[PDB]
Amino acid sequence: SHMLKKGMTTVLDFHPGTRRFLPQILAECARRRLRTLVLAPTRVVLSEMKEAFHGLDVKFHTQAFSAEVIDAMCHATLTYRMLEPTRVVNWEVIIMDEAHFLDPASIAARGWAAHRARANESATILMTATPPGTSDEFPHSNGEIEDVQTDIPSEPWNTGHDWILADKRPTAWFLPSIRAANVMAASLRKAGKSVVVLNRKKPDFILATDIAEMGANLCVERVLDCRTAFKPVLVDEGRKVAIKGPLRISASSAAQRRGRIGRNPNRDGDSYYYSEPTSENNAHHVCWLEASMLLDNMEVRGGMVAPLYGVEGTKTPVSPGEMRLRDDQRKVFRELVRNCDLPVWLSWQVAKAGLKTNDRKWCFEGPEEHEILNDSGETVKCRAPGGAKKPLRPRWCDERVSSDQSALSEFIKFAEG
């Protein structure tokens, strides 16, 4: 009942299925004239807020926050302004929608918002059906759900899975990779089905690798779940970032994938098919340390140190405050992540070293074991600073910059300029 009181932290575990409650809690924020911050996990959810808030006086920051008692923005848009030594904003209420996403900016924002609550500067409200620290693969739903443990193919099949296409309800299918989704998509369309592939009108199939691109608009009665995903994992005693998979997903991630169906109280019998078990052993995933780096470098009133939120403090391998940088170090760290589209972990390695954004030498002073290949198997090479064609070796290896042709291409454009 004291949601909007400074010092209060409140988790709201509404059944899935932004359009009803959030407009109301913002209204009382307006009547109380409390400076409110509304955080969204994705640009999709942020756009749905624009429609849901049309009768409200809310400032949306769809690109930057460089300047109305309610502010609405994405987690990343908040994290990156906090990386600058700038004017602190006394947000008295902080509301986070879908406070369960596990990208580093989302995690660090939870610890940031949770810190302002403990510091008595803000009231913090987290909204998610799967709060952090919950590990239940089958939580409550509005309508009853049919759970089925069964073998689900990852590649197209010519025998033994009649039940998939024999069901006619609109279906969402979570697959390990976009490559698998694209391959599967063509095989389902040659089978006569309508397919839509979500990536960076009702189809018979919607294929995606996560729930990030899915708004509340999506209408689906059945979910197939490979329950796997590739992840950026820390390897080699934590001095390299490698991509590994297909790995198991956590119980909350499977609960969120399953949460796409069962949203109607009137409709029972929605079906969720899965095979793989889940796993919570993910402390070696790089996103926790990347969340620490970000949070241990976001501006806070008083310059104080904050741990990650709740159970997410157990997952990070460092200790609160450990990844803080000097301001001159940090501005390269902020500039490299924001405008050069480089992984958070890698950008922190250059800032701890002391190099500068326009200097691209570190792309070259690396050992040959750090050399990057291509899809055809050859070793790529590009222009070093000064026009010298010198070989491409990162001083710190982060396999995210060479995961596909699109990655190392744009990583080369970073090396050349």
mmCIF file of N, CA and C in Angstrom, residues 245-351:
data_model
loop_
_atom_site.group_PDB
_atom_site.id
_atom_site.type_symbol
_atom_site.label_atom_id
_atom_site.label_comp_id
_atom_site.label_asym_id
_atom_site.label_seq_id
_atom_site.Cartn_x
_atom_site.Cartn_y
_atom_site.Cartn_z
ATOM 1 N N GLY A 245 27.254 -23.169 -26.891
ATOM 2 C CA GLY A 245 25.894 -23.653 -27.047
ATOM 3 C C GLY A 245 25.736 -24.838 -27.981
ATOM 4 N N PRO A 246 24.494 -25.322 -28.140
ATOM 5 C CA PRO A 246 23.310 -24.785 -27.456
ATOM 6 C C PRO A 246 23.218 -25.203 -25.985
ATOM 7 N N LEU A 247 23.229 -24.214 -25.095
ATOM 8 C CA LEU A 247 23.186 -24.449 -23.660
ATOM 9 C C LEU A 247 21.748 -24.435 -23.154
ATOM 10 N N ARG A 248 21.555 -24.998 -21.966
ATOM 11 C CA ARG A 248 20.238 -24.961 -21.356
ATOM 12 C C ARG A 248 19.912 -23.547 -20.886
ATOM 13 N N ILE A 249 18.616 -23.270 -20.771
ATOM 14 C CA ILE A 249 18.134 -21.983 -20.300
ATOM 15 C C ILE A 249 17.651 -22.137 -18.865
ATOM 16 N N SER A 250 17.495 -21.005 -18.181
ATOM 17 C CA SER A 250 17.058 -21.017 -16.794
ATOM 18 C C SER A 250 15.563 -21.319 -16.702
ATOM 19 N N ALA A 251 15.097 -21.529 -15.468
ATOM 20 C CA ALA A 251 13.686 -21.836 -15.255
ATOM 21 C C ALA A 251 12.800 -20.631 -15.548
ATOM 22 N N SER A 252 13.270 -19.426 -15.218
ATOM 23 C CA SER A 252 12.489 -18.225 -15.503
ATOM 24 C C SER A 252 12.365 -17.986 -17.003
ATOM 25 N N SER A 253 13.458 -18.183 -17.747
ATOM 26 C CA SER A 253 13.412 -18.000 -19.194
ATOM 27 C C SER A 253 12.409 -18.952 -19.831
ATOM 28 N N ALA A 254 12.391 -20.208 -19.381
ATOM 29 C CA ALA A 254 11.385 -21.146 -19.860
ATOM 30 C C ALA A 254 9.991 -20.747 -19.397
ATOM 31 N N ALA A 255 9.876 -20.171 -18.200
ATOM 32 C CA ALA A 255 8.574 -19.699 -17.740
ATOM 33 C C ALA A 255 8.089 -18.519 -18.570
ATOM 34 N N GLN A 256 9.010 -17.668 -19.024
ATOM 35 C CA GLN A 256 8.618 -16.528 -19.848
ATOM 36 C C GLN A 256 8.238 -16.960 -21.257
ATOM 37 N N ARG A 257 8.998 -17.890 -21.837
ATOM 38 C CA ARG A 257 8.617 -18.472 -23.120
ATOM 39 C C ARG A 257 7.254 -19.144 -23.024
ATOM 40 N N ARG A 258 7.042 -19.925 -21.962
ATOM 41 C CA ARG A 258 5.741 -20.541 -21.731
ATOM 42 C C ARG A 258 4.669 -19.492 -21.458
ATOM 43 N N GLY A 259 5.053 -18.361 -20.860
ATOM 44 C CA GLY A 259 4.154 -17.269 -20.537
ATOM 45 C C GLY A 259 3.526 -16.573 -21.723
ATOM 46 N N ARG A 260 3.956 -16.901 -22.944
ATOM 47 C CA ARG A 260 3.329 -16.319 -24.124
ATOM 48 C C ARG A 260 1.908 -16.830 -24.310
ATOM 49 N N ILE A 261 1.624 -18.042 -23.844
ATOM 50 C CA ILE A 261 0.308 -18.644 -23.973
ATOM 51 C C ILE A 261 -0.320 -18.759 -22.586
ATOM 52 N N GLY A 262 -1.610 -19.092 -22.563
ATOM 53 C CA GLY A 262 -2.365 -19.113 -21.327
ATOM 54 C C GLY A 262 -2.764 -17.752 -20.804
ATOM 55 N N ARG A 263 -2.690 -16.706 -21.632
ATOM 56 C CA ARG A 263 -2.938 -15.345 -21.169
ATOM 57 C C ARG A 263 -4.418 -15.002 -21.068
ATOM 58 N N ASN A 264 -5.295 -15.751 -21.746
ATOM 59 C CA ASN A 264 -6.720 -15.429 -21.705
ATOM 60 C C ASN A 264 -7.395 -16.192 -20.572
ATOM 61 N N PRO A 265 -8.089 -15.506 -19.661
ATOM 62 C CA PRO A 265 -8.841 -16.234 -18.627
ATOM 63 C C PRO A 265 -9.962 -17.085 -19.195
ATOM 64 N N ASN A 266 -10.510 -16.715 -20.354
ATOM 65 C CA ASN A 266 -11.608 -17.474 -20.939
ATOM 66 C C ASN A 266 -11.131 -18.759 -21.604
ATOM 67 N N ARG A 267 -9.893 -18.788 -22.096
ATOM 68 C CA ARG A 267 -9.393 -19.901 -22.897
ATOM 69 C C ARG A 267 -8.517 -20.801 -22.037
ATOM 70 N N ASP A 268 -8.979 -22.024 -21.806
ATOM 71 C CA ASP A 268 -8.151 -23.088 -21.266
ATOM 72 C C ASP A 268 -7.648 -23.964 -22.409
ATOM 73 N N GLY A 269 -6.643 -24.779 -22.107
ATOM 74 C CA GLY A 269 -6.155 -25.751 -23.062
ATOM 75 C C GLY A 269 -5.011 -25.300 -23.941
ATOM 76 N N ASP A 270 -4.459 -24.110 -23.710
ATOM 77 C CA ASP A 270 -3.255 -23.706 -24.421
ATOM 78 C C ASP A 270 -2.110 -24.654 -24.083
ATOM 79 N N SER A 271 -1.279 -24.941 -25.079
ATOM 80 C CA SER A 271 -0.323 -26.033 -24.994
ATOM 81 C C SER A 271 1.106 -25.511 -25.037
ATOM 82 N N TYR A 272 1.944 -26.053 -24.156
ATOM 83 C CA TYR A 272 3.367 -25.729 -24.091
ATOM 84 C C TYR A 272 4.151 -27.033 -24.172
ATOM 85 N N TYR A 273 4.883 -27.219 -25.266
ATOM 86 C CA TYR A 273 5.666 -28.424 -25.501
ATOM 87 C C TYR A 273 7.142 -28.119 -25.286
ATOM 88 N N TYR A 274 7.817 -28.982 -24.530
ATOM 89 C CA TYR A 274 9.231 -28.809 -24.230
ATOM 90 C C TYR A 274 9.878 -30.176 -24.086
ATOM 91 N N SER A 275 11.209 -30.190 -24.155
ATOM 92 C CA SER A 275 11.968 -31.423 -23.965
ATOM 93 C C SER A 275 13.056 -31.250 -22.915
ATOM 94 N N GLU A 276 14.053 -30.434 -23.249
ATOM 95 C CA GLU A 276 15.240 -30.282 -22.427
ATOM 96 C C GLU A 276 14.858 -29.829 -21.023
ATOM 97 N N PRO A 277 15.542 -30.314 -20.003
ATOM 98 C CA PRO A 277 15.382 -29.726 -18.671
ATOM 99 C C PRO A 277 16.003 -28.340 -18.633
ATOM 100 N N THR A 278 15.859 -27.644 -17.514
ATOM 101 C CA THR A 278 16.476 -26.338 -17.354
ATOM 102 C C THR A 278 17.658 -26.430 -16.393
ATOM 103 N N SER A 279 18.378 -25.320 -16.267
ATOM 104 C CA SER A 279 19.569 -25.275 -15.431
ATOM 105 C C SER A 279 19.757 -23.855 -14.926
ATOM 106 N N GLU A 280 20.201 -23.734 -13.677
ATOM 107 C CA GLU A 280 20.467 -22.441 -13.060
ATOM 108 C C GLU A 280 21.954 -22.138 -12.953
ATOM 109 N N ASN A 281 22.813 -23.068 -13.365
ATOM 110 C CA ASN A 281 24.260 -22.891 -13.273
ATOM 111 C C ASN A 281 24.707 -22.023 -14.444
ATOM 112 N N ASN A 282 24.700 -20.705 -14.221
ATOM 113 C CA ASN A 282 25.044 -19.757 -15.271
ATOM 114 C C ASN A 282 25.913 -18.610 -14.765
ATOM 115 N N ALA A 283 26.537 -18.754 -13.591
ATOM 116 C CA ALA A 283 27.403 -17.700 -13.075
ATOM 117 C C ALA A 283 28.597 -17.444 -13.981
ATOM 118 N N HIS A 284 28.977 -18.422 -14.803
ATOM 119 C CA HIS A 284 30.078 -18.243 -15.737
ATOM 120 C C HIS A 284 29.673 -17.464 -16.979
ATOM 121 N N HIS A 285 28.379 -17.222 -17.180
ATOM 122 C CA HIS A 285 27.938 -16.375 -18.279
ATOM 123 C C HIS A 285 28.415 -14.942 -18.061
ATOM 124 N N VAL A 286 28.848 -14.296 -19.147
ATOM 125 C CA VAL A 286 29.532 -13.012 -19.029
ATOM 126 C C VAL A 286 28.584 -11.877 -18.653
ATOM 127 N N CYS A 287 27.270 -12.080 -18.781
ATOM 128 C CA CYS A 287 26.331 -10.976 -18.597
ATOM 129 C C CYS A 287 26.337 -10.451 -17.166
ATOM 130 N N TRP A 288 26.615 -11.316 -16.187
ATOM 131 C CA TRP A 288 26.655 -10.874 -14.795
ATOM 132 C C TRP A 288 27.810 -9.913 -14.557
ATOM 133 N N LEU A 289 29.014 -10.290 -14.995
ATOM 134 C CA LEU A 289 30.167 -9.405 -14.857
ATOM 135 C C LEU A 289 29.969 -8.123 -15.654
ATOM 136 N N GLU A 290 29.368 -8.225 -16.845
ATOM 137 C CA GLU A 290 29.086 -7.030 -17.638
ATOM 138 C C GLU A 290 28.092 -6.121 -16.931
ATOM 139 N N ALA A 291 27.123 -6.709 -16.228
ATOM 140 C CA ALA A 291 26.217 -5.913 -15.412
ATOM 141 C C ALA A 291 26.962 -5.238 -14.270
ATOM 142 N N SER A 292 27.905 -5.952 -13.650
ATOM 143 C CA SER A 292 28.717 -5.345 -12.600
ATOM 144 C C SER A 292 29.516 -4.165 -13.141
ATOM 145 N N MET A 293 30.225 -4.364 -14.254
ATOM 146 C CA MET A 293 31.003 -3.297 -14.890
ATOM 147 C C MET A 293 30.174 -2.045 -15.103
ATOM 148 N N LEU A 294 28.988 -2.235 -15.680
ATOM 149 C CA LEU A 294 28.095 -1.113 -15.938
ATOM 150 C C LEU A 294 27.659 -0.455 -14.635
ATOM 151 N N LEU A 295 27.100 -1.241 -13.711
ATOM 152 C CA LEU A 295 26.664 -0.679 -12.436
ATOM 153 C C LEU A 295 27.837 -0.117 -11.642
ATOM 154 N N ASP A 296 28.992 -0.784 -11.681
ATOM 155 C CA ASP A 296 30.169 -0.270 -10.985
ATOM 156 C C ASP A 296 30.821 0.834 -11.810
ATOM 157 N N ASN A 297 30.058 1.436 -12.702
ATOM 158 C CA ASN A 297 30.515 2.620 -13.410
ATOM 159 C C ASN A 297 29.391 3.601 -13.704
ATOM 160 N N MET A 298 28.166 3.353 -13.250
ATOM 161 C CA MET A 298 27.092 4.328 -13.422
ATOM 162 C C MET A 298 27.140 5.378 -12.324
ATOM 163 N N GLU A 299 26.810 6.612 -12.688
ATOM 164 C CA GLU A 299 26.797 7.695 -11.718
ATOM 165 C C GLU A 299 25.719 7.466 -10.668
ATOM 166 N N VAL A 300 26.103 7.624 -9.404
ATOM 167 C CA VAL A 300 25.190 7.540 -8.274
ATOM 168 C C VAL A 300 25.427 8.753 -7.389
ATOM 169 N N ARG A 301 24.345 9.280 -6.815
ATOM 170 C CA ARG A 301 24.465 10.361 -5.845
ATOM 171 C C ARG A 301 25.315 9.914 -4.666
ATOM 172 N N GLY A 302 26.302 10.732 -4.312
ATOM 173 C CA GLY A 302 27.233 10.374 -3.267
ATOM 174 C C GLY A 302 28.355 9.467 -3.709
ATOM 175 N N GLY A 303 28.348 9.020 -4.961
ATOM 176 C CA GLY A 303 29.403 8.153 -5.459
ATOM 177 C C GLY A 303 29.543 6.863 -4.684
ATOM 178 N N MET A 304 28.431 6.310 -4.212
ATOM 179 C CA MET A 304 28.477 5.117 -3.377
ATOM 180 C C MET A 304 28.385 3.834 -4.197
ATOM 181 N N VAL A 305 28.715 2.720 -3.553
ATOM 182 C CA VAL A 305 28.833 1.419 -4.202
ATOM 183 C C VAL A 305 27.566 0.618 -3.946
ATOM 184 N N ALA A 306 27.074 -0.060 -4.985
ATOM 185 C CA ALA A 306 25.856 -0.844 -4.907
ATOM 186 C C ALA A 306 26.059 -2.229 -5.500
ATOM 187 N N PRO A 307 25.570 -3.267 -4.833
ATOM 188 C CA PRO A 307 25.592 -4.607 -5.417
ATOM 189 C C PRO A 307 24.456 -4.783 -6.416
ATOM 190 N N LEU A 308 24.518 -5.894 -7.147
ATOM 191 C CA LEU A 308 23.423 -6.232 -8.038
ATOM 192 C C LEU A 308 22.180 -6.574 -7.218
ATOM 193 N N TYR A 309 21.045 -6.663 -7.901
ATOM 194 C CA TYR A 309 19.769 -6.801 -7.213
ATOM 195 C C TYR A 309 19.541 -8.243 -6.774
ATOM 196 N N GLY A 310 19.340 -8.435 -5.471
ATOM 197 C CA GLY A 310 18.903 -9.724 -4.955
ATOM 198 C C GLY A 310 19.848 -10.857 -5.306
ATOM 199 N N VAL A 311 19.278 -11.929 -5.868
ATOM 200 C CA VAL A 311 20.043 -13.124 -6.208
ATOM 201 C C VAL A 311 21.109 -12.821 -7.249
ATOM 202 N N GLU A 312 20.918 -11.764 -8.039
ATOM 203 C CA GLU A 312 21.869 -11.407 -9.079
ATOM 204 C C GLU A 312 23.191 -10.909 -8.513
ATOM 205 N N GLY A 313 23.258 -10.631 -7.209
ATOM 206 C CA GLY A 313 24.542 -10.392 -6.577
ATOM 207 C C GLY A 313 25.341 -11.657 -6.357
ATOM 208 N N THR A 314 24.660 -12.804 -6.255
ATOM 209 C CA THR A 314 25.357 -14.083 -6.151
ATOM 210 C C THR A 314 26.015 -14.471 -7.468
ATOM 211 N N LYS A 315 25.428 -14.059 -8.591
ATOM 212 C CA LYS A 315 25.867 -14.529 -9.897
ATOM 213 C C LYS A 315 27.136 -13.841 -10.381
ATOM 214 N N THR A 316 27.388 -12.599 -9.965
ATOM 215 C CA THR A 316 28.557 -11.902 -10.490
ATOM 216 C C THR A 316 29.832 -12.396 -9.801
ATOM 217 N N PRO A 317 30.921 -12.589 -10.555
ATOM 218 C CA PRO A 317 32.151 -13.108 -9.938
ATOM 219 C C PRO A 317 32.971 -12.065 -9.196
ATOM 220 N N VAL A 318 32.718 -10.774 -9.405
ATOM 221 C CA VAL A 318 33.471 -9.737 -8.707
ATOM 222 C C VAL A 318 32.673 -9.252 -7.505
ATOM 223 N N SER A 319 33.203 -8.252 -6.806
ATOM 224 C CA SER A 319 32.574 -7.720 -5.613
ATOM 225 C C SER A 319 32.148 -6.277 -5.857
ATOM 226 N N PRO A 320 31.004 -5.841 -5.298
ATOM 227 C CA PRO A 320 30.496 -4.486 -5.575
ATOM 228 C C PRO A 320 31.539 -3.383 -5.460
ATOM 229 N N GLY A 321 31.698 -2.612 -6.539
ATOM 230 C CA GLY A 321 32.670 -1.543 -6.617
ATOM 231 C C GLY A 321 33.963 -1.911 -7.316
ATOM 232 N N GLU A 322 34.145 -3.186 -7.668
ATOM 233 C CA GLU A 322 35.448 -3.661 -8.123
ATOM 234 C C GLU A 322 35.796 -3.156 -9.517
ATOM 235 N N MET A 323 34.796 -2.887 -10.348
ATOM 236 C CA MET A 323 35.035 -2.580 -11.753
ATOM 237 C C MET A 323 34.958 -1.085 -12.053
ATOM 238 N N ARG A 324 35.114 -0.257 -11.022
ATOM 239 C CA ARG A 324 35.037 1.185 -11.213
ATOM 240 C C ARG A 324 36.289 1.710 -11.909
ATOM 241 N N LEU A 325 36.101 2.746 -12.723
ATOM 242 C CA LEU A 325 37.172 3.332 -13.511
ATOM 243 C C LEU A 325 37.321 4.802 -13.160
ATOM 244 N N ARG A 326 38.470 5.362 -13.525
ATOM 245 C CA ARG A 326 38.608 6.806 -13.503
ATOM 246 C C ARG A 326 37.689 7.409 -14.556
ATOM 247 N N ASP A 327 37.344 8.681 -14.357
ATOM 248 C CA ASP A 327 36.400 9.346 -15.252
ATOM 249 C C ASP A 327 36.930 9.397 -16.681
ATOM 250 N N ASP A 328 38.225 9.680 -16.841
ATOM 251 C CA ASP A 328 38.828 9.661 -18.170
ATOM 252 C C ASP A 328 38.825 8.253 -18.755
ATOM 253 N N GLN A 329 39.110 7.241 -17.929
ATOM 254 C CA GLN A 329 38.959 5.858 -18.377
ATOM 255 C C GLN A 329 37.525 5.578 -18.803
ATOM 256 N N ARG A 330 36.562 6.055 -18.017
ATOM 257 C CA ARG A 330 35.171 5.661 -18.194
ATOM 258 C C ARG A 330 34.552 6.268 -19.448
ATOM 259 N N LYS A 331 34.967 7.476 -19.831
ATOM 260 C CA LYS A 331 34.338 8.125 -20.977
ATOM 261 C C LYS A 331 34.662 7.404 -22.281
ATOM 262 N N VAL A 332 35.880 6.876 -22.413
ATOM 263 C CA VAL A 332 36.181 5.976 -23.525
ATOM 264 C C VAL A 332 35.342 4.711 -23.408
ATOM 265 N N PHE A 333 35.249 4.173 -22.190
ATOM 266 C CA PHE A 333 34.425 2.996 -21.944
ATOM 267 C C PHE A 333 32.970 3.258 -22.311
ATOM 268 N N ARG A 334 32.452 4.441 -21.975
ATOM 269 C CA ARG A 334 31.075 4.759 -22.343
ATOM 270 C C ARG A 334 30.944 5.010 -23.838
ATOM 271 N N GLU A 335 31.881 5.766 -24.413
ATOM 272 C CA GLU A 335 31.812 6.090 -25.836
ATOM 273 C C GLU A 335 31.957 4.847 -26.706
ATOM 274 N N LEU A 336 32.806 3.905 -26.295
ATOM 275 C CA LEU A 336 33.022 2.714 -27.113
ATOM 276 C C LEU A 336 31.796 1.805 -27.121
ATOM 277 N N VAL A 337 31.091 1.705 -25.993
ATOM 278 C CA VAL A 337 29.895 0.870 -25.960
ATOM 279 C C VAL A 337 28.750 1.550 -26.697
ATOM 280 N N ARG A 338 28.565 2.852 -26.467
ATOM 281 C CA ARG A 338 27.361 3.520 -26.946
ATOM 282 C C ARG A 338 27.387 3.725 -28.457
ATOM 283 N N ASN A 339 28.475 4.288 -28.987
ATOM 284 C CA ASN A 339 28.511 4.679 -30.390
ATOM 285 C C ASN A 339 29.362 3.776 -31.271
ATOM 286 N N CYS A 340 30.212 2.930 -30.696
ATOM 287 C CA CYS A 340 31.008 1.999 -31.483
ATOM 288 C C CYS A 340 30.468 0.576 -31.447
ATOM 289 N N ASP A 341 29.380 0.334 -30.714
ATOM 290 C CA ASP A 341 28.702 -0.963 -30.678
ATOM 291 C C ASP A 341 29.678 -2.096 -30.367
ATOM 292 N N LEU A 342 30.420 -1.934 -29.276
ATOM 293 C CA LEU A 342 31.339 -2.976 -28.863
ATOM 294 C C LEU A 342 30.867 -3.618 -27.565
ATOM 295 N N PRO A 343 31.076 -4.926 -27.400
ATOM 296 C CA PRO A 343 30.660 -5.599 -26.163
ATOM 297 C C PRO A 343 31.175 -4.881 -24.920
ATOM 298 N N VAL A 344 30.353 -4.886 -23.870
ATOM 299 C CA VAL A 344 30.698 -4.199 -22.628
ATOM 300 C C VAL A 344 31.991 -4.755 -22.049
ATOM 301 N N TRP A 345 32.138 -6.080 -22.061
ATOM 302 C CA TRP A 345 33.324 -6.698 -21.476
ATOM 303 C C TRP A 345 34.595 -6.233 -22.173
ATOM 304 N N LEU A 346 34.574 -6.179 -23.506
ATOM 305 C CA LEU A 346 35.761 -5.777 -24.254
ATOM 306 C C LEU A 346 36.085 -4.305 -24.024
ATOM 307 N N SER A 347 35.068 -3.440 -24.079
ATOM 308 C CA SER A 347 35.293 -2.011 -23.888
ATOM 309 C C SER A 347 35.868 -1.709 -22.513
ATOM 310 N N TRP A 348 35.570 -2.546 -21.518
ATOM 311 C CA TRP A 348 36.154 -2.333 -20.202
ATOM 312 C C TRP A 348 37.636 -2.675 -20.188
ATOM 313 N N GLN A 349 38.058 -3.629 -21.020
ATOM 314 C CA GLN A 349 39.467 -4.003 -21.064
ATOM 315 C C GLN A 349 40.326 -2.885 -21.638
ATOM 316 N N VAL A 350 39.790 -2.111 -22.582
ATOM 317 C CA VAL A 350 40.574 -1.021 -23.154
ATOM 318 C C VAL A 350 40.611 0.166 -22.200
ATOM 319 N N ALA A 351 39.532 0.374 -21.441
ATOM 320 C CA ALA A 351 39.483 1.501 -20.516
ATOM 321 C C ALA A 351 40.381 1.260 -19.312
#
